[PDB]
Design an enzyme around this catalytic site. Structure first.
Site, PDB file in Angstrom:
ATOM      1  N   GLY A 197       3.137   6.585   9.864  1.00  0.00           N
ATOM      2  CA  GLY A 197       4.583   6.383   9.640  1.00  0.00           C
ATOM      3  C   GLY A 197       5.100   5.005  10.079  1.00  0.00           C
ATOM      4  O   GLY A 197       6.188   4.591   9.614  1.00  0.00           O
ATOM      5  N   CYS A 235       3.978   1.905   9.609  1.00  0.00           N
ATOM      6  CA  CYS A 235       3.804   0.824   8.609  1.00  0.00           C
ATOM      7  C   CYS A 235       5.152   0.313   8.118  1.00  0.00           C
ATOM      8  O   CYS A 235       6.054   1.112   7.791  1.00  0.00           O
ATOM      9  CB  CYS A 235       2.932   1.258   7.445  1.00  0.00           C
ATOM     10  SG  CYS A 235       1.278   1.296   8.139  1.00  0.00           S
ATOM     11  N   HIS A 286       0.842  -1.227   0.000  1.00  0.00           N
ATOM     12  CA  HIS A 286       0.000   0.000   0.000  1.00  0.00           C
ATOM     13  C   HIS A 286       0.868   1.265   0.000  1.00  0.00           C
ATOM     14  O   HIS A 286       0.280   2.378  -0.060  1.00  0.00           O
ATOM     15  CB  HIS A 286      -1.072  -0.020   1.092  1.00  0.00           C
ATOM     16  CG  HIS A 286      -0.619   0.166   2.498  1.00  0.00           C
ATOM     17  ND1 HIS A 286      -0.686  -0.858   3.427  1.00  0.00           N
ATOM     18  CD2 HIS A 286      -0.250   1.276   3.173  1.00  0.00           C
ATOM     19  CE1 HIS A 286      -0.300  -0.401   4.602  1.00  0.00           C
ATOM     20  NE2 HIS A 286      -0.022   0.911   4.476  1.00  0.00           N
TER      21      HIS A 286
HETATM   22  C1  LIG Z   1       0.536   2.878   7.608  1.00  0.00           C
HETATM   23  O1  LIG Z   1       0.327   2.751   6.233  1.00  0.00           O
HETATM   24  C2  LIG Z   1       1.534   3.963   7.707  1.00  0.00           C
HETATM   25  N1  LIG Z   1       1.621   4.881   6.579  1.00  0.00           N
HETATM   26  O2  LIG Z   1       2.266   4.070   8.656  1.00  0.00           O
HETATM   27  C3  LIG Z   1      -0.827   3.200   8.262  1.00  0.00           C
HETATM   28  C4  LIG Z   1      -0.877   3.279   9.792  1.00  0.00           C
HETATM   29  C5  LIG Z   1      -2.137   4.004  10.268  1.00  0.00           C
HETATM   30  C6  LIG Z   1      -2.140   4.707  11.640  1.00  0.00           C
HETATM   31  C7  LIG Z   1      -2.963   5.842  10.999  1.00  0.00           C
HETATM   32  C8  LIG Z   1      -2.478   5.364   9.627  1.00  0.00           C
HETATM   33  N2  LIG Z   1      -1.852   2.250   7.786  1.00  0.00           N
HETATM   34  C9  LIG Z   1      -2.802   2.592   6.907  1.00  0.00           C
HETATM   35  O3  LIG Z   1      -2.918   3.706   6.397  1.00  0.00           O
HETATM   36  C10 LIG Z   1      -3.767   1.497   6.507  1.00  0.00           C
HETATM   37  C11 LIG Z   1      -3.752   1.335   5.011  1.00  0.00           C
HETATM   38  C12 LIG Z   1      -5.040   1.940   4.479  1.00  0.00           C
HETATM   39  C13 LIG Z   1      -5.880   2.406   5.638  1.00  0.00           C
HETATM   40  N3  LIG Z   1      -5.123   1.935   6.808  1.00  0.00           N
HETATM   41  C14 LIG Z   1      -5.512   1.886   8.089  1.00  0.00           C
HETATM   42  O4  LIG Z   1      -4.746   1.482   8.961  1.00  0.00           O
HETATM   43  C15 LIG Z   1      -6.915   2.404   8.399  1.00  0.00           C
HETATM   44  N4  LIG Z   1      -7.658   1.354   9.060  1.00  0.00           N
HETATM   45  C16 LIG Z   1      -8.853   0.915   8.599  1.00  0.00           C
HETATM   46  O5  LIG Z   1      -9.417   1.449   7.634  1.00  0.00           O
HETATM   47  N5  LIG Z   1      -9.367  -0.123   9.286  1.00  0.00           N
HETATM   48  C17 LIG Z   1     -10.547  -0.933   8.911  1.00  0.00           C
HETATM   49  C18 LIG Z   1     -10.156  -1.742   7.674  1.00  0.00           C
HETATM   50  C19 LIG Z   1     -11.732  -0.017   8.616  1.00  0.00           C
HETATM   51  C20 LIG Z   1     -10.882  -1.847  10.093  1.00  0.00           C
HETATM   52  C21 LIG Z   1      -6.956   3.727   9.175  1.00  0.00           C
HETATM   53  C22 LIG Z   1      -8.405   4.207   9.318  1.00  0.00           C
HETATM   54  C23 LIG Z   1      -6.380   3.625  10.587  1.00  0.00           C
HETATM   55  C24 LIG Z   1      -6.149   4.756   8.387  1.00  0.00           C
HETATM   56  C25 LIG Z   1      -4.770   0.448   4.338  1.00  0.00           C
HETATM   57  C26 LIG Z   1      -4.491  -0.027   2.922  1.00  0.00           C
HETATM   58  C27 LIG Z   1      -5.535  -0.558   5.185  1.00  0.00           C
END
Ligand SMILES: *[C@](O)(C(N)=O)[C@H](CC1CCC1)NC(=O)[C@@H]1[C@@H]2[C@H](CN1C(=O)[C@@H](NC(=O)NC(C)(C)C)C(C)(C)C)C2(C)C
Ligand SMILES: *[C@](O)(C(N)=O)[C@H](CC1CCC1)NC(=O)[C@@H]1[C@@H]2[C@H](CN1C(=O)[C@@H](NC(=O)NC(C)(C)C)C(C)(C)C)C2(C)C
EC number: 3.4.19.12
Lengths: 304, 304
Positions: B143, B145, B41
């Site tokens: 950050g 991830c 991602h």
């Molecule tokens: C990492 O990608 C990063 N850049 O460090 C990140 C960590 C989180 C903490 C806030 C951002 N992860 C994501 O961005 C991850 C990528 C998209 C959306 N992501 C999520 O973790 C989301 N969770 C989510 O939508 N959970 C469900 C699926 C609804 C239960 C957030 C809402 C926390 C951003 C993907 C591809 C899953």
């Protein structure tokens, strides 16, 4: 999101850990430049430890009695002194892996990482608080002596603790890297009392802010309080008195949560008076006092 | 003495952490030999994350779109693939600090150390359990991830976890190093449920043994019980059923304490039925299930 007891990454300190042997006693040393630091009781027999005269005992020892090993490499000792309760062993070889470092004496309520070591090999890393009574609640088996506590500032390792002894509760006492004990302790196996240990009020507040930032808000009530008023509830519950220095230190967390410190004190008062009624805050059924405001800001705004 | 949540020393993994950048997304990568592993991602815009077609998105990307940085050193990408939910970026330069390593898929109830990283720089290390529902309760900000979970066997780093996403409680889901999610999760920002999460009964027993070894014995009562009988109390309290495999695994702790597992189950039953009545076990007001028997034997007999 999420909030865990986190240690500094330990790599920079791993490269400094050596094994120190005199007679049959082996413990850990810290090898920085051409100097290895370890607890001076490395020179003692089990018998000696009862009432040691370290000056007289050290006099029986010469450079060649000190077996310093870095991995499978024997260092050559070209000097020895005692500074307070630490031996400094001067070696021919500067540690090529010496990080940028300082020696600091930490204050009660401050945190540090411990790299628990055996025979000069790192086993594990965990976070500790210097308790108000200058003990720590560590995990330290026979062999752990000379394991060190530290903070990392940028690329700079501040060493603050060397492990020396265990006290009757399973609590730990040790020195700074100049060999000065934290607290009233001496390196002798005779009756010694740790003071009564208080709760680090400012740490508990920082942790309640941590709980709010992470969405645990249930303990947030309708009330407020005064410095005088809360500090009267503190006294009764063996909490350290909160100062304006403490209120000022909580600023960043206050400002991030838009919750006044004195409101947060009101929630704390009600928790101290009513307990937690079987509920949890950040997965704990107890008030946690081993996170500094600094540790909370670090974890909850992610600094490297 | 003493018993703490301890992580493996992190040095060997610090030397493997790099920063990975595609468009404006930056996260962490794991640089082993001539291959950098990160979450796929990294190729997505915020919009993409809603319903990404990773194959089509990856096709828009060439080797030169991937900015891999090791400290202040840019690596040259000479190949890219997707394996399940991980990107593998082939680089010209083998990591000179590559430790002896394996990729393992861990089982529910097993523990590992997380080296929480931001912009390819390590911030901190803590111990985690793969929950029965294949989530972890970590500390992971924007950050984080591509931060990795691991165990150290001798000199051999077994990588078992890469961080991908956060679920609605503040709980964490991620993959093994082949890019297979633990649990039913997919790397898409759409409604997804973690299962109901059970208590790791064998871990709680190991921790009660830890408590006994460290002199906390108050919960040790006059009674005993049967596998069938305890496992009926377990079902009601959302504990995983105890097997003979589990009894056998507890052997070393049983033998060290001279306490039969089934007696220890009787104490556990009474704690589950009566609660803890305001008392603490190893400074916890809750039953702790994030220590394996292995972790207890390691800490309480001090292996490096
Ligand atoms: C990492 O990608 C990063 N850049 O460090 C990140 C960590 C989180 C903490 C806030 C951002 N992860 C994501 O961005 C991850 C990528 C998209 C959306 N992501 C999520 O973790 C989301 N969770 C989510 O939508 N959970 C469900 C699926 C609804 C239960 C957030 C809402 C926390 C951003 C993907 C591809 C899953
Ligand atoms: C380290 O030296 C080591 N070799 O690793 C060791 C750690 C402890 C854990 C069991 C051995 N520390 C000591 O041996 C330390 C040295 C003697 C006696 N020491 C103690 O820690 C003793 N504590 C003690 O006597 N406590 C008081 C002073 C009675 C409160 C033990 C009883 C735990 C051995 C000296 C010089 C203090």
């Amino acid at each position: 999101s999420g909030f865990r007891k986190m240690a500094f990454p330990s790599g920079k300190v791993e490269g400094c850990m050596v094994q120190v042997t005199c007679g049959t006693t082996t413990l850990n040393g810290l090898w920085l430049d051409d100097v290895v630091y370890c607890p001076r009781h490395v020179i003692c027999t089990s018998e000696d430890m009862l009432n040691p005269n370290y000056e007289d005992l050290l006099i029986r020892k010469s450079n060649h009695n000190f077996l310093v090993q870095a991995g499978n490499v024997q260092l050559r000792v070209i000097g020895h002194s005692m500074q307070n309760c630490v031996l400094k062993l001067k070696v021919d070889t500067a540690n090529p892996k010496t990080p940028k470092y300082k020696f600091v004496r930490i204050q009660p309520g401050q945190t540090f990482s411990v790299l628990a070591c055996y025979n000069g090999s790192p086993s594990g890393v965990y976070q500790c608080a210097m308790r108000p009574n200058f003990t720590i609640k560590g995990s330290f088996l026979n062999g752990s002596c000379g394991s060190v506590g530290f903070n990392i500032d940028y690329d700079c390792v501040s060493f603050c603790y060397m492990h020396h002894m265990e006290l009757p509760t399973g609590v730990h006492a040790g020195t700074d890297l100049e060999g000065n004990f934290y607290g009233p302790f001496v390196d002798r196996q005779t009756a010694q009392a740790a003071g009564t240990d208080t709760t680090i009020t400012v740490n508990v507040l920082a942790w309640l802010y941590a709980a709010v930032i992470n969405g645990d808000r249930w303990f947030l009530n309708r009330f407020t309080t005064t410095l005088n008023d809360f500090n009267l509830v503190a006294m009764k519950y063996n909490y350290e008195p909160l100062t304006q220095d403490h209120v000022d230190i909580l600023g960043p967390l206050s400002a991030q949560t838009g919750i006044a410190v004195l409101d947060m004190c009101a929630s704390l008062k009600e928790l101290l008076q009513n307990g937690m009624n079987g509920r949890t805050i950040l997965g704990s059924a107890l008030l946690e006092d081993e996170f500094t405001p600094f540790d909370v800001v670090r974890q909850c705004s992610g600094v490297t």
